[PDB]
Structures are given as structure tokens and as C-alpha cells.
């Protein structure tokens, strides 16, 4: 490679053959990726290679329901572009334009019928969407708006009953959401407020008991969360603080026992974390340090051995990596590269 | 409730809200079920209640891609019948016939497009299939044959690239298989032999690195296995023994770190098990005893806390249950009921 709260520097996925693979942007605006040779914690890595392209957003990988990876990014023309594996353990297509004019990172999820649907902000700050017309396949539909006025990147997650739901910060800095009223459809609710005051993009997970749960940095730079009180349904809970003082977006992942764990940069620029204790319904630990000096939010993912691995940019712009060991966490190691923050909303 | 190697006595699922739920048959041939109140190991259970019906196969539950449970069973007329939740956290439809004449338990899997496809043996011992025409929905297609001559219940599993693949014992007692050549299609291979000599139904998993792997009791009543050597592809490995002397079908589940674990009844009628050590690519432990006196194969499943829970019938015909603890395994507890072995092939 050539020499809102702060964003994640990469998009990551645990692939259909149990390998972690990360996607980032270099100084000349190409998308690069790096992947484990082997499905295990501490595997050697491929090194960075270029998928080319010229991007003005975070590149966002999603796995099709046939296992083919696909990467979505905004182009220098502000259209949505994508590139995909032509077969599950094979090479990549060329970049192709899906048109439109977008003003955020793209957010992607599979409908229950295997059709990817992509969400992105438009020039008037409304939310727009486009989708595959058949399972993991073009042609794509035409773009349409779900309205709203949003001031963060959008985040999408499917409910435990198959209904897509999108979250985003509003002009007032509250968290807003909107949802399919039926799976696989274009029947959507009105936008509704979940109040609060957020200063990062929202991070969304579906818990082990089927409740959507949203994490976000608050006005006070603590980590807050809120959730559906019953499976795939409102009413929502109150906003609740998980404390901390954080200087980047939060990342959240599930341990293999479904204990949630949140990661974020601290006031000392180290990686900090907090996790549920004992089980997925337990209380949260105090924030604790994983050291390092990082220049992006962290990106967390669970690997094929069931361990959380966390990636973050260093002061040198290389991507570094630390992972859970039986005892503790490993010392940071460098994967090299020279990565830039290409987020469409900063 | 009213007062090949041996089969499993129940079908089990970890539901979309993290609850285990089991389905069995009573003396009067109705399908009954029992489920955890709460998404945790050692949760209280509902007790047994009847979904009615009159069945002559194991009832087999599958979770639609919108989270609705659906149960498939052969009727006393030898047709395939089914019943489904009308909404993800709600009640059940009535039993409805999908017609045909079948001579095995049904085997079910979701295509990459969300369409359930059901496989079952016919009156000439060929394999037949029928499917939903749209994602998690009727109407259903008409029945069609994939030929072959089979002498065990069939087992289906999707490859890590979205291709369905069906396994079954042949007239010669070898393991045979057949596969989609493309996802979501009716384009299937010829039947092909994987040789060996098997004396149970095949049990199939997809490993953490995307390889199908099949377990079966051998001629010598040891547990054998065989696998794809690369992700979603032949060539297959040699048959390899995991030893043991087993008096029921094997059940296999993944620990939350992806270590495979096999369970089966022993010569002393206790539950025995063997597991991969250290990680998902590790070697297998020696067989060890979990006690009990059981009158069916075990049924294994991983719960919402990431623990394996194992169910088996007792000498009294109640369903008993034991689960992993931090240290060890819990003492057997009774869930009651009076369950019969209704398997269409014994
Ligand atoms: O040509 C449009 C492309 O759309 C992608 O989303 C799909 O994964 C590709 O297979 C191709 O159809
Ligand atoms: O808060 C009310 C709404 O909550 C949403 O999260 C849910 O998807 C809707 O179906 C409705 O329940
Ligand atoms: O460093 C201490 C902590 O590390 C976390 O990742 C893990 O979830 C906790 O169980 C505890 O081990
Ligand atoms: O009426 C046919 C039924 O087929 C089931 O497989 C489906 O889950 C039901 O919703 C219903 O369509
Ligand atoms: O053994 C040869 C075959 O093995 C199957 O398991 C696989 O699904 C096929 O695509 C082909 O590779
Ligand atoms: O009883 C001893 C064994 O129990 C198994 O279920 C588990 O996979 C092993 O890790 C070991 O604990
Ligand atoms: Cl570059
Ligand atoms: Cl707009
Ligand atoms: Cl999630
Ligand atoms: Cl930068
Ligand atoms: Cl009964
Ligand atoms: Cl037939
Ligand atoms: Cl599996
Ligand atoms: Cl019986
Ligand atoms: Mg994977
Ligand atoms: Mg579940």
C-alpha cells in the first residue's frame, strides 16, 4: 500500500469457510483486503491486496446467502458501486455502478428471501434503498426513499421475525428508527423517535433472545444502550448508561456464549472494553484496558475458534490486531497496510 | 400424556428467541411439544402439550427464515403433513396435507432463497422432494423424484456455498449422496457412493471451515465419520473410525467454539460421548460416560447460553435431560411425558 465519533477503519467478516477478512481504503482511494490463510485464531494473513476502485465511503462487506462476499461503497461520482465474488471460494467481479446519489456509507442486510437490500442517505438527507430482485442476484430494483432527515450513517438489522429495521441519528441528535411491517416487502412504518442524544453512529445487534439492541455514544461521551423489551417488538426500554469516557464509535460483538462485549477508544487513546458477565442476561463489567494507541474506532468479530478478535488503526496507519486467549488478550500485532478514514459522514 | 440403530425420540430446535423446544409422539400418535420458559440453561419447562395429529413418522421441526417453527410428519394415510406457527411468537395452524406417499421420516432444509424443501423416501424406495414456492410460504410445488434406492431415512444439509445435499444408506449399506449443482434449483447430480458400511441413519454437519461431514454407526458398531476435503467440495476423505461400541444412532452438535461432539447410547445403556479437544481442528477424546439408562438415541443441541443440552428417553418413557456445566455435566432430570418411537424406518 502507498505511504460523529471517529469511525471504524475496516469492514470485517467471518467467511463461509471460517476465515476473517477485512476491507479498507488506501491513500489513493482503492479498496484493499487482507484475510486469514487458516480458520484459526492467530492464523497467518494474506497481506493487503487491491480490489481497485475509487471510493468516498467506508467499503462495507456483506455475505450473500450463497456465501459469496460482496462489497458496497460510494464512488467519487457519489453513486453506489459494488463488487462481488463470482463464486464462494473464487475471485472477484469488476466494480459495477448501481447509480443514485448518496451521502452516507451504505448499510446492507439480507431479507428472509435472500435478497440483499442496501440503505443509504441521499442529497436531502432522507434514507433511500435498493435491492437484489432475486436471491443473491441482480438485476437490482430501482432506488426509492423512506424519507426522514438523518445526520449519521444508517444501520440496518433484521428482527428475529424477519423484518428489516433501520436506525439513524435525526437532526435533533436523537435516535430514530423505521421498520418493515412484513418481511420481504416494501411496506414500511413511519419513522419514530427513540429519543436520547447520540454522538456516534448507532451499532445494532440482535440478542440471543431475539431483541434488537442499539448502542451509541451519548452527549457525555459515555456508552449508552437501549432495546426492544420483547422479541422483535416494542415497547422499547429506557436509554441506559454503560458509563465509560469514549473517544471513538463503539463496536459490539457476541462472545460464543452470547455475552455481549463493547469496545471503544479511551481518553488515553488505548482500546477499552466492557462485557456482560456470567451469561447473556448478566450485568456489565467495569471498563478495562486492552492497551495500544489507536487512531480509529475498533472493529470486533468472533472467529472460527469462537474468540473475539479486534482490529484498529495505529499511529503509523497500519491495521493492528489483538484477540482473546484462554487467560486474557494477546499483545497487539501489526497487519501492516496504510489505511485512511474514508467515511462519507465524519 | 397417555400412559438401523435405535432412533432419536424427539426433534429439537433453538428458537428465534433463544428457547429450546422439543417435539415428540405419544401412544395415541399425536405430536406433543415442550419448551423452555426462559432462554437459559436449566430454565423451567412448559410441560407437554398436544399439537394433535396422527403420525407414523418422527415429527421433524424446522425453523423458517422468518423464525416461524414448522413441523413435518407422515400421516396414517402415508402422506406428508405439516403444521406451522402462524406468527413467530404465536400459535399454530391446523395440520394440512402435502399429499404424496412416503416411506421415511421427512428431511428438511431451507434453500438460500428461504424456500423450505422437504425430502422423503417413496414406495419404490427412491428419494422424492417438494418445496415452498416462495420464501417461507406455500403454495407448495408438486412432488418429484431424484431416484436412487435407499434403506435409511434421508438427511439433508446445505453446503457452505448454498447447494443442498442429501445423504442416505443404499441397498448395499454404503453411504450415498446427491447434490444440487446450483442453489435454489432443480439441477441435481447423479447419486454417488461414499462406500463404507453403515448401520445407522447418517448425521450431517457443516464444519466451521465450510466442509460437510457425515457421522454414522458402522458394521462393527463403532462411530465412523467422513468429510469433504475442501470447502463445499469433493474429493471426500476416507472413512475414519472414532471407535466406541454404540447401541443407538449418534447425535452430533457443535460446542460454541465449534468443537464437534458426538453422543450415543453405550453397551451399558448409558449416554456416552466423545468431543474434539482444544479447537475445531483438534483430535477426538476417548469415549466417556454421562450415565443414565436410556431407551432412545440422544438428541443434542446448543442452547442460548452456549451450552450443549442432551435429551433422551428413559426406561419409564419420560424424556430426560442433562447439560454442560462449567465443571462437568448436570445430573439427569425428567421432563416427564410418555413418548414412543414413531420412526418410519426402524
Ligand atoms: O450483476 C449484478 C450483481 O449483483 C450482485 O449483488 C450479485 O451478487 C452479483 O451476482 C450480480 O448479480
Ligand atoms: O416500538 C414499536 C415498534 O418497535 C419496532 O422495533 C418493531 O419492529 C415494530 O414492529 C413495533 O413493535
Ligand atoms: O480480559 C478479561 C475479559 O476478556 C473479555 O473479552 C471476556 O469477555 C471476559 O470473559 C474476560 O476474559
Ligand atoms: O398453507 C401452506 C403453508 O405452508 C407452510 O410451509 C408455510 O410455513 C405456511 O405459512 C403456509 O403457507
Ligand atoms: O465428490 C464430488 C462432489 O462432492 C459433493 O459433496 C459436492 O457437493 C459436489 O459439488 C462435488 O464436489
Ligand atoms: O465432561 C467433560 C467434557 O464435556 C464435554 O461436553 C466438553 O465438550 C468437554 O470440553 C469436556 O468438558
Ligand atoms: Cl489506494
Ligand atoms: Cl434525499
Ligand atoms: Cl447480532
Ligand atoms: Cl485518515
Ligand atoms: Cl398421543
Ligand atoms: Cl419411490
Ligand atoms: Cl451444522
Ligand atoms: Cl416405542
Ligand atoms: Mg463463518
Ligand atoms: Mg436461536
DSSP collapsed to 3 states, B210-266: CCEEEEEEECCCCEEEEEEEECCEEEECCCEECCCCECCCCEEEECCCCCEEEEEEE
Q: Could you write out the DSSP letters of every residue in A37-59?
A: SSSSTT--B---EE----BSS--
For residues A167 and A148, the answer to whether their CB atoms sit within 8 Å is no
Least Cα distance to A320 among A270, A275, A255 occurs for: A270
Instruction: Give dist(CA A248, CA A237) in Å, integer.
Output: 24
Best probe residue, ligand 4, of B132, B133, B139, B141 (max atoms within 8 Å of C-beta) = B132
Burial A127-147 (b: 16+ CB within 10 A, else e): bbbbbbeebbbeebeebeebe
Please name every residue paired with A128 in a beta bridge, in sequence order, or none if there are none: A120, A145
Cβ of B88 less than 6 Å from ligand 4: no
Q: Which of A184, A280, A281 sits opposite B135 (nearest CB)?
A: A184
Q: What DSSP element (H or E) covers A127?
A: strand A127-134
Angle at B324 between CA B323 and CA B325, to 5 degrees: 115
Q: Could you write out the DSSP letters of every residue in A51-120?
A: ----BSS--EEEE-TTS-EEEEEEBTTS-EEEEEBSSTTS-B---EE------S--EEEE-TTS-EEEEE
Instruction: Give dist(CA A12, CA A35) in Å, integer.
Output: 10
Identify the DSSP state of A26. Answer: -
Q: Is residue A29 part of a domain?
A: no
Strand order in the sheet with B333-334: B299-302, B308-313, B319-323, B333-334
Residues 6+ apart with CB under 8 A from B134: A113, B114, B115
Q: Is residue A322 part of a domain?
A: no
**Which residues in chain A are followed by a discontinuity, with C-to-N distance exceeding 2.5 angstroms?**
3
* Number of domains into which chain A is organized: 1
Residues 6+ apart with CB under 8 A from B119: B106, B107, B108, B127, B128, B129, B154, B156, B166
Instruction: Give dist(CA B296, CA B298) in Å, integer.
Output: 6
Q: Are strands A60-63 and A49-50 parallel, antiparallel or unpaired?
A: unpaired
Domain residue limits at A112: 63-296
How close are the terminal C-alpha atoms of chain B, in Å?
Answer: 23
For residues B10 and B21, the answer to whether their CB atoms sit within 8 Å is no
Give me the phi and psi of B34, to 5 degrees please. -150, 140
Instruction: Give dist(CA A269, CA B112) in Å, integer.
Output: 43
Candidates B87, B209, B276: best to mutate against A (most CBs of A within 10 A) is: B209
Q: Is residue A332 part of a domain?
A: no
Instruction: Give dist(CA B205, CA B202) in Å, integer.
Output: 10
Burial A269-291 (b: 16+ CB within 10 A, else e): eebbbbbbeebbbeebeebeebe
Grouping H, G, I as helix, E, B as strand and the rest as coil, residue B334 is strand
Cβ atoms < 10 Å from Cβ of A19: 23
Identify the DSSP state of A287. Answer: P
Q: Is residue A247 part of a domain?
A: yes
Identify the DSSP state of B6. Answer: P
Ligand nearest to the CA of B88: 4
Instruction: Give dist(CA A338, CA A313) in Å, integer.
Output: 9
What 3 state SS string does B260-303 have? EEEEEEECCCCEEEEEECCCCCCCECCCEECCCCECCECEEEEC
- CATH number, domain at A241? 2.120.10.70
Cβ atoms < 10 Å from Cβ of B278: 10
Cα B306–chain centre separation = 19
Instruction: Give dist(CA A18, CA A40) in Å, integer.
Output: 8
Q: Is residue A158 part of a domain?
A: yes
Interface residues of chain B, partner chain A, Cβ below 8 Å: 16-18, 39-40, 64-67, 87-89, 111-114, 134-136, 160-162, 183-184, 207-210, 230-232, 255-258, 279-281, 304-307
Locate A169 and state its grid cell. 441519528
Looking from the CA of B288 toward its CB, the CA atoms found within 13 Å total 9
Candidates A35, A37, A90, A160: best to mutate against B (most CBs of B within 10 A) is: A160
Least Cα distance to A236 among A186, A170, A283, A179 occurs for: A179
Q: Is residue A187 part of a domain?
A: yes
Cβ atoms < 10 Å from Cβ of B306: 21
Query: Where do we find the cell 466492557?
Result: A274
Q: Is residue A341 part of a domain?
A: no
Residues 6+ apart with CB under 8 A from B316: none
Q: Is residue A51 part of a domain?
A: no
Q: What DSSP element (H or E) covers A18?
A: none
Amino acid at each position: 500500500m502507498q505511504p460523529i465519533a471517529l469511525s471504524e477503519i475496516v469492514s470485517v467478516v467471518n467467511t463461509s469457510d471460517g476465515r476473517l477478512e477485512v476491507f479498507g481504503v488506501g491513500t489513493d482511494k482503492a479498496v484493499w483486503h487482507n484475510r486469514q490463510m487458516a480458520p484459526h485464531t492467530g492464523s497467518p494473513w494474506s497481506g493487503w491486496s487491491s480490489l481497485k476502485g475509487q471510493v468516498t465511503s467506508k467499503p462495507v462487506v456483506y455475505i450473500n446467502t450463497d456465501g459469496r462476499l460482496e462489497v458496497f461503497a460510494r464512488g467519487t461520482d457519489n453513486a453506489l458501486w459494488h463488487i462481488w465474488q463470482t463464486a464462494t471460494n473464487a475471485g472477484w467481479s469488476n466494480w459495477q455502478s448501481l447509480g443514485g446519489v448518496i451521502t452516507s456509507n451504505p448499510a446492507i442486510y439480507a431479507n428472509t428471501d435472500g435478497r440483499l437490500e442496501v440503505f443509504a442517505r441521499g442529497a436531502d438527507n432522507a434514507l433511500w434503498h435498493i435491492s437484489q430482485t432475486t436471491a443473491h442476484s441482480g438485476p437490482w430494483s430501482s432506488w426509492a426513499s423512506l424519507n426522514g432527515v438523518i445526520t449519521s450513517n444508517p444501520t440496518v438489522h433484521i428482527n428475529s421475525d424477519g423484518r428489516l429495521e433501520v436506525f439513524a441519528r435525526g437532526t435533533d441528535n436523537a435516535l430514530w428508527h423505521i421498520w418493515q411491517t412484513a418481511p420481504d416487502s416494501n411496506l414500511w412504518s413511519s419513522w419514530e423517535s427513540l429519543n436520547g442524544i447520540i454522538t456516534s453512529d448507532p451499532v445494532v445487534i440482535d440478542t440471543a433472545d431475539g431483541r434488537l439492541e442499539v448502542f451509541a455514544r451519548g452527549a457525555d461521551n459515555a456508552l449508552w444502550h437501549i432495546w426492544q423489551t420483547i422479541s422483535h417488538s416494542g415497547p422499547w426500554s429506557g436509554w441506559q448508561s454503560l458509563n465509560g469516557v469514549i473517544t471513538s464509535a463503539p463496536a459490539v460483538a457476541k462472545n460464543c456464549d452470547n455475552r455481549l462485549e463493547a469496545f471503544a477508544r479511551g481518553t488515553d487513546n488505548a482500546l477499552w472494553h466492557t462485557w456482560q458477565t456470567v451469561s447473556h442476561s448478566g450485568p456489565w463489567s467495569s471498563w478495562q484496558s486492552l492497551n495500544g494507541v489507536i487512531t480509529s474506532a475498533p472493529t470486533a468479530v468472533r472467529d472460527a475458534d469462537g474468540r473475539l478478535e479486534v482490529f484498529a488503526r495505529g499511529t503509523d496507519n497500519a491495521l493492528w490486531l489483538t484477540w482473546q486467549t484462554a487467560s486474557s488478550w494477546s499483545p497487539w500485532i501489526s497487519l501492516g497496510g496504510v489505511l485512511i478514514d474514508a467515511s462519507a459522514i465524519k
